[PDB]
């Protein structure tokens, strides 16, 4: 059977879910329980964590502009997602997506991670650049598995404390 239902008009679906593509929800997964995890991410949203995904992430910035803060070759770099851009991020490249614009919309496609293949989430020192804290997670569901991880980082000066220079990372807003 068509487990995932019939085709349907995507711009209309994005319009209809506009209330969810802004704070505090910010994103909406299109189909549930599929191998391909297909999400539309709105804005505005800024964040300070970097994602270490053990699989690739595809992006197609449909509306508005965004950008990814990256580590590439041990160096801080930015990949702009201008409206209309597509991009494929290889495994493990660290990214912290920034989505400044309201009414923006990006198609993001990932794969379910198999048992034993973990995601990392991590934060780096604004002053010296050293890794501050990393947590590895078996990501089964974004909505229950991820916000407590971030919240536990923001609530602890210990987790936020740079082991190189001792500066305490700011937590939620940079
Ligand atoms: Cu990611
Ligand atoms: Fe530091």
XYZ file of C-alpha atoms and ligand atoms in Angstrom:
176
model
C 0.000 0.000 0.000
C 1.004 3.704 -0.088
C 2.089 3.716 3.509
C 2.966 7.407 3.252
C -0.161 8.488 1.453
C -0.714 10.098 -1.945
C 1.307 12.978 -3.528
C 0.263 16.423 -2.359
C 1.105 20.061 -3.126
C 4.149 21.065 -1.105
C 3.809 24.901 -1.167
C 0.267 24.538 0.115
C 1.374 22.190 2.851
C 4.134 24.669 3.884
C 1.497 27.568 3.948
C -0.877 25.418 6.030
C 1.863 24.590 8.562
C 3.161 28.270 8.786
C 2.097 28.401 12.483
C 4.479 25.560 13.208
C 7.458 26.893 11.155
C 8.213 29.625 13.744
C 9.012 29.678 17.506
C 8.627 27.846 19.601
C 8.095 24.711 17.354
C 10.194 25.892 14.360
C 10.016 22.681 12.205
C 7.662 19.970 11.082
C 8.429 16.440 9.874
C 6.473 15.583 6.739
C 6.019 11.791 7.094
C 6.232 9.674 10.169
C 7.978 6.326 10.628
C 9.801 6.499 7.263
C 13.443 5.738 6.584
C 13.906 9.129 4.933
C 13.303 11.795 7.554
C 11.863 14.687 5.561
C 11.523 18.001 7.590
C 10.628 21.641 6.755
C 12.478 24.050 9.042
C 11.224 27.662 9.405
C 12.660 30.582 11.442
C 13.655 32.596 13.127
C 16.081 30.358 15.082
C 19.650 30.851 16.211
C 21.544 28.244 18.173
C 25.015 27.500 19.500
C 25.202 23.721 19.311
C 27.043 21.899 16.527
C 25.547 18.682 15.071
C 27.819 15.679 14.274
C 25.495 13.527 12.119
C 26.920 10.107 11.276
C 24.959 10.270 7.880
C 24.520 12.908 5.170
C 21.987 15.828 5.353
C 20.442 17.283 2.207
C 19.176 20.896 2.185
C 17.015 22.804 -0.243
C 16.348 26.356 0.992
C 12.874 26.917 -0.571
C 12.052 30.260 0.965
C 14.174 32.911 2.598
C 17.872 32.603 3.531
C 19.818 30.765 6.236
C 23.400 29.715 6.926
C 25.367 26.932 8.479
C 28.237 27.587 10.844
C 30.718 24.789 10.191
C 34.061 23.345 11.222
C 35.889 22.490 7.972
C 39.613 21.517 8.167
C 39.830 22.542 11.855
C 38.673 26.083 10.973
C 35.367 28.048 11.492
C 33.576 28.452 8.169
C 30.140 29.408 7.031
C 28.073 27.838 4.249
C 25.312 30.280 3.117
C 21.906 28.741 2.219
C 20.475 31.428 0.040
C 16.882 31.020 -1.130
C 16.936 28.554 -4.022
C 20.231 26.854 -2.909
C 20.707 23.081 -2.461
C 23.610 21.488 -0.557
C 24.691 18.025 0.552
C 26.606 17.887 3.897
C 28.942 14.899 4.204
C 28.908 12.719 7.390
C 30.380 14.168 10.527
C 30.969 17.646 9.334
C 30.024 19.757 12.464
C 27.083 22.435 11.644
C 25.191 24.795 13.594
C 22.334 26.083 11.446
C 21.259 29.678 11.777
C 17.835 30.756 10.412
C 17.367 34.466 10.983
C 14.308 35.088 8.825
C 10.679 34.651 9.720
C 8.657 32.949 6.929
C 11.731 31.059 5.751
C 11.456 27.376 4.852
C 14.079 24.806 4.222
C 13.587 21.163 3.092
C 16.011 18.994 5.056
C 16.319 15.312 4.322
C 18.192 12.829 6.613
C 18.017 9.036 7.148
C 16.960 7.116 10.287
C 19.989 6.080 12.187
C 20.408 2.353 12.800
C 20.825 0.961 16.336
C 24.445 1.683 17.470
C 25.008 4.573 15.108
C 25.047 7.679 17.282
C 24.624 11.483 16.753
C 26.820 13.947 18.576
C 25.899 17.380 19.793
C 28.582 19.668 20.917
C 29.605 23.215 21.899
C 32.876 25.016 21.358
C 34.592 27.855 23.327
C 33.963 31.370 21.866
C 37.379 32.518 23.234
C 39.775 29.711 22.449
C 37.787 27.391 20.181
C 38.325 24.262 22.156
C 35.520 21.639 22.488
C 33.504 22.487 25.665
C 31.041 19.563 25.911
C 29.764 16.770 23.662
C 26.866 14.355 24.264
C 26.272 11.311 21.955
C 22.712 10.223 21.546
C 20.795 7.348 19.785
C 18.394 9.622 18.023
C 15.044 7.792 17.837
C 12.832 10.854 18.043
C 13.877 14.502 17.806
C 11.060 15.809 19.931
C 11.777 13.701 23.100
C 15.489 12.887 22.610
C 16.924 16.293 21.853
C 15.524 19.291 23.766
C 16.468 17.815 27.266
C 20.043 17.347 25.998
C 20.244 21.031 25.106
C 18.447 22.120 28.254
C 20.901 20.129 30.462
C 23.801 21.926 28.760
C 22.236 25.481 29.350
C 21.482 24.572 33.018
C 25.085 23.515 33.982
C 28.106 25.785 34.338
C 30.161 22.602 34.728
C 29.092 21.358 31.273
C 29.571 24.870 29.896
C 33.102 25.296 31.290
C 35.900 25.311 28.807
C 38.550 22.684 29.798
C 41.284 24.652 27.954
C 40.869 28.197 29.152
C 38.059 27.987 31.831
C 35.699 30.458 30.176
C 31.988 29.475 30.811
C 30.123 29.164 27.464
C 27.023 31.380 27.413
C 24.509 28.558 27.011
C 21.392 29.313 24.879
C 22.034 32.703 23.093
C 25.665 33.203 21.825
Cu 22.250 18.133 11.507
Fe 38.299 28.076 25.975
